[PDB]
């Protein structure tokens, strides 16, 4: 398309999910040249949807994959490769260098942001149209981070949530509103949310909704709802007792709309939700202590009701298999009356639970909604840690 995108539709009814994309990265990367990645996501241009992830500068099999448990180094880069290919050395494309990213297409071209540097002197440079436009230095000197899933734009404005400061406390979260890679405005986190990490966002009907991570005290997730037209936001938590961070305490009967739900402290996992009244689905790990399994539950009015319990559900990865990061994306340039809600799950593999190998890496499963009620299967990464020995 050659004109800015405007979020003029609402979600479609979510009555089950169907597979959209599957990688099989780690099973193929046992013999081919696949790159070690982590923090995946998916994002669509008007033209194509592509898988996106943070790379580690080595292939699974090469000797340099030893040590990729580590989150940030100067050999990480945000790459892109076609939907359902593995992230190969030969078909990947680097969008920028850094260890935390977000990227989105405003309708005319795309914004990609990589953050880089030492933990006390990190920088973000915002690439607009494969050229570096603006950069932002750190403001609280402690690991400036950002989304790890796509940003969303409305008429050229693309809000992006950044956090800088402790992960075990108060930190400094700001919402930036870029347009054509330039900073129109920015604001501090405002709302009842206590800490913000790795927001997963989608937009419909001119409003952007982000479901995030409270790493400091939450087991229920902060929601930030942004108005890209007035460039303002509010934050609250999901009211539902169906707790969705991980690790988590056991689900209560009454949740907490304005406060962290108490139980696990100083930990979390990136996660998403489609919050649309009765049409609300939530994703969560099946395990309470670990990144294993992944289910999607329909919990109507979960955002506002502190007694919301599931009414339909769907198993995406069995609890006997590993899951990991999850986030949302939508094909905004898909034809039709409404938007088809989609999500991805990161399937982490390697260190530290499967320490027999010295790499950590992952693969991708993505699903998108249907209105049919479709049968469910589960979707394992699939590799045998024993053939890499």
């Amino acid at each position, epitope marked *: 398309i050659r004109d800015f995108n405007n979020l003029t539709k609402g979600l479609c009814t979510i009555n089950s999910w169907h597979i959209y994309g599957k990688d099989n990265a780690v099973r193929i990367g046992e013999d081919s040249d696949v790159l070690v990645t982590r923090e995946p996501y998916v994002s669509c241009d008007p033209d194509e949807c592509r898988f996106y992830a943070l790379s580690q500068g080595t292939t699974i099999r090469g000797k340099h994959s030893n040590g990729t448990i580590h989150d940030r180094s100067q050999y990480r880069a945000l790459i892109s490769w076609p939907l359902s290919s593995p992230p190969t050395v030969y078909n990947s494309r680097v969008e920028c260098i850094g260890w935390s990213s977000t990227s989105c297409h405003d309708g005319k071209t795309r914004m990609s942001i990589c953050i880089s540097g030492p933990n006390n002197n990190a920088s973000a440079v915002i690439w607009y149209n494969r050229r570096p436009v603006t950069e932002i230095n750190t403001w609280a000197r402690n690991i400036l981070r950002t989304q790890e899933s796509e940003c969303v734009c409305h008429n050229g404005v693309c809000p992006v949530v950044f956090t800088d400061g402790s992960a075990t406390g108060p930190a400094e979260t700001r919402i930036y509103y870029f347009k054509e890679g330039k900073i129109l405005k920015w604001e501090p986190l405002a709302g009842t949310a206590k800490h913000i990490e790795e927001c997963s966002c989608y937009g419909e009907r001119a409003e952007i909704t982000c479901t995030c991570r409270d790493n400091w005290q939450g087991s229920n997730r902060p929601v930030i709802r942004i108005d890209p037209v007035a460039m303002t936001h509010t934050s609250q938590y999901i009211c539902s007792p169906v707790l969705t961070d991980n690790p988590r305490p056991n689900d209560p009967t009454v949740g907490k709309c304005n406060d962290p739900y108490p139980g696990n402290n100083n930990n979390g996992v990136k996660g998403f939700s489609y919050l649309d009244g009765v049409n609300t689905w939530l994703g969560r790990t099946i395990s309470i202590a670990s990144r294993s399994g992944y289910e999607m539950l329909k919990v109507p009015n979960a955002l506002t009701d502190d007694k919301s319990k599931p009414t339909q559900g769907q198993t995406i990865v069995l609890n*006997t298999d590993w899951s990991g990061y999850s986030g949302s994306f939508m094909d905004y340039w898909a034809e039709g009356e409404c938007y088809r809600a989609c999500f991805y799950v990161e399937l982490i593999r390697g260190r530290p639970k499967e320490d027999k190998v010295w790499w950590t890496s992952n693969s991708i499963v993505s699903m998108c909604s249907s209105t049919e009620f479709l049968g469910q299967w589960d979707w394992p990464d699939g590799a045998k840690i024993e053939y890499f020995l």
Partner: nanobody
Amino acid sequence: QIQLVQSGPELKKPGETVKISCKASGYTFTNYGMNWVKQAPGKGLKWMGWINTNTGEPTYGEEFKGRFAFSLETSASTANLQINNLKNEDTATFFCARGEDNFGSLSDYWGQGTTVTVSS
């Protein structure tokens, strides 16, 4: 709700084999694998391995790779421990524990124990 009820305690002379059952109740067998733990008379608690009640693949602790064999009557929600060529120092109590997650890092819900006394 969840009950893991184990077989009763056996006596076996050295060299014999034993099959200890663990019948699961209250959960869907298939989404939660089984931990087998040995609490030896003095020594305390030890992880013997975990069985993927979905695929059926067992992991053995290195101490247990060999004479020990995990299997399951899937169909009846039973997991079983089989210790072949019983050694006299295998007298102890074996617990099946449900593993909360993949690999069983958490044993929420343990069975009653089946105590073996290897003795001529």
